[PDB]
Design a protein around this ligand. Structure first.
Ligand SMILES: *[C@@H]1O[C@H](CO)[C@@H](O[C@@H]2O[C@H](CO)[C@@H](O)[C@H](O)[C@H]2NC(C)=O)[C@H](O)[C@H]1NC(C)=O
Ligand SMILES: COCCN(CCc1ccc(Br)cc1)C1CCN(c2nccs2)CC1
Ligand SMILES: [Br-]
Ligand SMILES: [Br-]
Length: 358
């Protein structure tokens, strides 16, 4: 089984024990660690943070004692230009420039592959996205024909049915990618103005859910139905939770809200909490496991957060193995309890143990 784990460079700037650098990562925890994110500048792949070369080194050092560990560099994100990615994929000139720039950059900085995290191609760039993936794979094939270990090509794909329908040609890009990480979190499941778990495993109670596609099971089944081999499918599991400010004494799935939850001390973003922030939050809170959805939420005062814990990620790993998928993907290592402030990496270690069947 694959255990694909993301590291985010901006996590270095977090205060106190939130500060996360690649040397805090257990070199044996994951089979693949993906560094997020790299830039596209002048139609070339390039660094993003000022100390990216150094952090690259800290990350790829981890393979010294661990030769099986593979690393990829992720390009894209949600604070990208996105028009830039479309320009590179649509403009043939920019496309050849980017594709040619990638293998030497990766070899120079010690990465074993590239990860595409374009969010999102859209209706206009579905075909350009397919072309980009095909020609990227072709250049990787050419670069290593003289008996070199071939560069890997992966892609993080949305788990949202609408985005999947408008953005991806699944059966075509699946034959070129080494694996597909399906982002089975950030689901916009709940009715508007209402609490909902952002990463439920199953639909759960039928009349308590606005639609059928806003759950992990549906997204995995759909991507399989569209022609993605199970052996190339890596199911994403979040080490973060989605939070809401309650508007009433109702604390269940479906309760009214006035907006996003209060930002955590370390990540400082309304509506989201890192898992260690959630561990701090759990002191004094009540945890209810959503019966049909197999994931927990925790409530305290006017605060509601749907998250994943050790039991729920064990359940999700059992799901992916029953489906015979390639493994699990984790977003993100720096959002797990990496310093063990509440052992270390509790959620990712739970995923890793659960991946070891029986
Ligand atoms: C990522 O790449 C983009 C594209 O080259 C950079 O955008 C330019 O940044 C310079 C410096 O601030 C500006 O003067 C230009 O006007 C920008 N051009 C465009 C088209 O956006 C961006 O700075 C890069 N980011 C990082 C962190 O390296
Ligand atoms: C409002 O946030 C929406 C963006 N979501 C969540 C970001 C977030 C997490 C924790 C905190 Br605390 C604050 C923000 C990301 C999640 C993972 N991501 C990818 N996974 C694989 C490749 S790209 C897609 C977008
Ligand atoms: Br419909
Ligand atoms: Br359907």
């Amino acid at each position: 089984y694959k255990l694909v784990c993301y590291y985010t460079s901006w996590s270095q700037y977090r205060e106190g024990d939130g500060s996360c650098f690649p040397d805090a990562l257990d070199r044996f925890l994951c089979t693949h660690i993906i560094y997020s994110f790299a830039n596209i500048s002048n139609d070339h792949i390039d660094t993003w943070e000022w100390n990216d070369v150094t952090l690259y080194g800290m990350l790829n050092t981890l393979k010294n004692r661990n030769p099986n560990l593979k690393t990829l560099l992720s390009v894209g994100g949600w604070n990208f230009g996105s028009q830039r990615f479309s320009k590179i994929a649509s403009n043939t000139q920019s496309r050849r420039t980017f594709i040619k720039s990638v293998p030497p950059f990766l070899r120079t900085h010690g990465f074993d592959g590239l990860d595409l995290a374009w969010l999102y191609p859209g209706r206009r760039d579905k075909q350009h996205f397919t072309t980009l993936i095909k020609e990227m794979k072709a250049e990787f094939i050419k670069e290593a024909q003289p008996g070199k270990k071939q560069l890997l090509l992966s892609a993080a794909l949305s788990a949202g049915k609408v985005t999947i329908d408008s953005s991806y040609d699944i059966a075509k890009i699946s034959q070129h990618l080494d694996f597909i990480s399906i982002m089975t979190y950030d689901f916009h499941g709940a009715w508007r103005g209402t609490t909902g778990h952002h990463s439920p495993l199953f639909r759960g109670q039928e009349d308590a859910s606005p639609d059928r596609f806003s759950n992990t099971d549906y997204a995995v089944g759909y991507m399989l139905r569209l022609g993605a081999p199970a052996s190339k499918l890596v199911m994403g599991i979040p080490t973060f939770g989605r939070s809401f400010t309650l508007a009433s004494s109702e604390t269940g799935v479906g309760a009214p809200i006035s907006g996003p939850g209060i930002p955590g001390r370390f990540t400082k973003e309304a509506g989201t909490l890192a898992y260690y922030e959630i561990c701090d939050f759990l002191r004094g809170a009540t945890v209810h496991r959503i019966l049909g959805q197999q994931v927990p939420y925790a409530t305290k005062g006017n605060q509601w957060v749907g998250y994943d814990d050790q039991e729920s990620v064990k359940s999700k790993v059992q799901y992916l193995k029953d489906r015979q998928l390639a493994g699990a993907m984790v977003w993100a290592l720096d959002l797990d309890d990496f310093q063990g402030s509440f052992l270390r990496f509790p959620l990712t270690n739970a995923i890793k143990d659960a991946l070891a069947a029986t």
